Symmetry: C3
Subunit: 390 residues, 3 copies
């Protein structure tokens, strides 16, 4: 029949108020505060966390302070192994209340909640980002959130640790936790190499023109939201490519200029006209490598006919020393995709190349270049096919 959830005679359940908080977190789970590692209280038998709060598919979970040490996890038996420390909800277990309201002695042993060590394959089979307690088709009884990589050494030693920042809602994004900026940078300058096609390094090192003959690799400020993207884990592609961690429609903004742009000088032989040189700036996706996403997870396969290159700026050099550009596009991207930006032009510098024959600040370069990448829509349901191919 038609059932109301929420109406005057309805009873409201645990499962209901959880389904509602999930909705309010934009279906993101994570640590809302604390639950970082407390290394002072961390022996070779035991691993300690600080207090705090997390939401996992709508279920609120707390580690309370008392007495530090806020909570302890048994590590005895773990040795020479990298594991994930995970917070897990297991709805097969029974929570055990004791005592009574009306005294003030009501308390619960929440056996449905545990902190545990999992290997990567086990965590992936029950990872909140891919499976749900509330799922329509394959609903689960157990679901986990990974918090730290824990690499155990020798028995007797205390382990090494690396926070899983994608599962902490830190900062960046309280208010719109599943959306917002994915990556952004400050203005930088980058030397254009003498080739037809090259990537623009978006991951925080540019080849900056520094003198009339040389450029040098120079850090610039960049930020990424680790829930949404990461730097490519292969060094070959690390300067240039992002790995997308979450499916969506994304907005890419770019702006900058091309400085010391090439062009054909007015001779009398061309009727005293500037001969412009064609260039374009494109964004690109590529899903040919699997398992680039966090944990080596399986990539999400894009719909048939999906785009791979899109022109953001396409024009001729105009005969000026410096020429500015800007562009904004929305584009579909998928978990596991590489995303990057390319500069393309001809390679004959006396006929068709936007770049000249100089080096450093005498050679053609991007100046004042910056971008922002932002997640602005999801690709659930029919959007996957209607919106996901471009």
């Amino acid at each position: 029949v038609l059932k109301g959830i929420n109406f005057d005679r309805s009873i409201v359940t645990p499962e209901n108020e959880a389904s509602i908080l999930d909705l309010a977190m934009q279906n993101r789970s994570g640590v809302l505060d604390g639950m970082t590692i407390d290394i002072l209280n961390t022996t070779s038998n035991q691993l300690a966390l600080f207090h705090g709060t997390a939401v996992l598919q709508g279920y609120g979970i707390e580690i309370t302070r008392a007495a530090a040490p806020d909570v302890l996890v048994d590590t005895t038996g773990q040795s020479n192994e990298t594991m994930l420390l995970c917070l897990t909800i297991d709805l097969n277990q029974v929570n055990v209340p004791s005592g009574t309201v009306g005294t003030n002695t009501y308390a619960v042993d929440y056996k449905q909640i545990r902190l545990e060590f999992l290997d990567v394959p086990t965590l992936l089979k029950q990872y909140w980002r891919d499976h749900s307690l509330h799922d329509l088709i394959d609903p689960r009884r157990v679901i986990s959130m990974p918090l730290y990589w824990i690499t155990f050494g020798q028995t007797g030693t205390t382990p090494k640790y690396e926070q899983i920042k994608s599962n902490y809602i830190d900062g960046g994004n309280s208010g719109n936790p599943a959306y917002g900026i994915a990556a952004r940078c400050e203005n930088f300058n980058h030397f254009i190499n003498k080739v037809a096609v090259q990537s623009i390094p978006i991951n925080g090192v540019a080849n900056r023109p520094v003198s009339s003959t040389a450029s040098q690799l120079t850090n610039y400020k960049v930020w990424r939201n680790p829930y949404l993207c990461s730097q490519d884990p292969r060094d070959k592609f690390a300067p240039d490519n992002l790995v997308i961690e979450e499916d969506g429609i994304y907005r890419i903004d770019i702006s900058g200029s091309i400085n010391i742009a090439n062009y054909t000088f007015p001779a009398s032989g061309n009727s005293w006209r500037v001969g412009g040189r064609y260039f374009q700036i494109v964004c690109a996706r590529n899903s040919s490598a699997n398992n680039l996403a966090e944990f080596g997870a399986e990539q999400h396969l894009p719909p048939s006919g999906v785009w791979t290159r899109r022109v953001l700026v396409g024009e001729y050099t105009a005969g000026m020393t410096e020429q500015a550009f800007s562009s904004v596009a929305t584009i579909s991207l998928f978990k596991g995709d590489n995303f990057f930006l390319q500069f393309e032009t001809g390679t004959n510098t006396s006929r068709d190349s936007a770049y000249n024959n100089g080096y450093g600040t005498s050679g053609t370069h991007l100046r004042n270049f910056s971008y922002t990448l932002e997640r602005v829509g999801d690709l659930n349901g029919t959007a996957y096919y209607d919106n996901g191919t471009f």
Copy 2:
């Protein structure tokens, strides 16, 4: 007096937890999953829906599975008529509980919830998008959400159906359900007609240059969010105009280039200078036609002094074969408005026109053109006057 809602001694009601979930849906109602038509179980007496879940002004409503057929609606008496199948909340009715908690036999006949057929005028008088159970000034006791157009034939036949996608939260938008992208497209190329003022077709067919003498009508990928906009229902305007379905401040992004742009060649008679030709790209709203919104609903009237044309790009051709452009603006739009984009230039090709005398790829055209339209703000309360005129 001062009443707390939520405080230690407060009692929390149905009406309260509903007012709170509404808030969490950004005041959007709709189907959250399922509740599509189940045509296998659908006779000439009866219409069947699949299970699922919806929220209607904060009230959660469920069709449960058991035993398919997940629920049935009596169609007997309906004949040669187009109706709306609607989910309706009627707070004048009594929900009837039976049995007891503490047994496990508590159950409710929710007479406050029904599936029914309404005609368009009746649905409009009680449509959630225009009236509210929670309204300050005119609060209602009955409110509906339309799910399908149902066109009944002859007695004996089974009816035809069309989903009302604006009332399903499918995909596109889980997380920001009342906002997000309204329309977007992939890059396309469009021939510029030899006239002073023309619309740029934004609804998925362009006149693409294909040869040195001809262009041809060619589909390009486009997507629209049917909650926010639709293609104009008049064929005259269907290639070019959107109908806005929801009031708001919207962001319009455009980018592209003008290719084979015209200009006056350096002769000795102009002192060997390029004579640029003025053009502009404008966005436009027009509310002169009423009842373009879904269901023929009444348009929302804009504040006095409202804008109708805004220049996004205004400059001269620069003497290059191809010249790129980009622009981002925020603009007010109202339910029932037409929105479109125009290219404007002079019509004397030897003096003031940005376009030349060629056709197809020899004639002046937009290349790599794309847009995104996004709802970014509402126009409730004082914003209607302070923000709504531009």
Copy 3:
């Protein structure tokens, strides 16, 4: 131990359902409707408000109608003084229930909620925007929201009032209450003064070219969200500078054109080439003045190494009468900062200036200029250092 909040055996508290609604308001508090001043019922003894509803760190508060006058606040004793009328939650007090459910006589005197007059320093020490009932480190028991400046005259007179619009969720922003547009304007034209560095007036008065010899100060439409920004309160800077009221990552969009742009004409002495003139449009932040934010609150100090100027457009004039530009950037801004936009160029009009020697419509000017500033991210937690310096 591990505590569940929300699970089958959990008890859900006041404090819990409040922490959850806060989350759903994006941690913004404010008036959701009504609670404006009711001056008809407002004597020299007493101040009257209309009914309505507010949320204060997750606690819902109501003034009910009955019988107008919807509620009264005692003003006796207040004289020749500007005060803040504030809604305050005081969790040290006891709410006093009376009567019984099962009769229909249950009622509560909510002594935890009061309307009161505070001076500015007292309000600031307990202002919801800077302190929280839920705070991790310094949790409070009392918290306030200011609603009106109330300036009391002579005993016998009734007071003057000014609404605190930052604390009313009016309009603009229902759905994304802590984010969305901060400021926006319609297209305007502004004369470029003959100086190296000048601000572009963004606060609704431009110096519009009106004739071949003159410009004139002319209003244009602008809007600001008073939760996020305000016009600078110092007249010296009021045409040009915003004060940021809320920390965040913001997006700035600009577009427009430079009209009657200067350049060096092709003589035979430069080999018949256009000599372009460099200009740039920059956005700027400055935190050197403290206490510009609402109420004279303390500015939030930016991380060490924070940006102060960023180039949005940097290029040469191209020899055309009018040249368009556009740019989009994300930038960090802090409570108390000034934000403004600058046009920079050389000052020798026969060599390096983008501007010429004319005035009014004969002189170089911005045309069709507009902007939008939007809050798109927060700077809580680690984002303050990782994202906040640029």
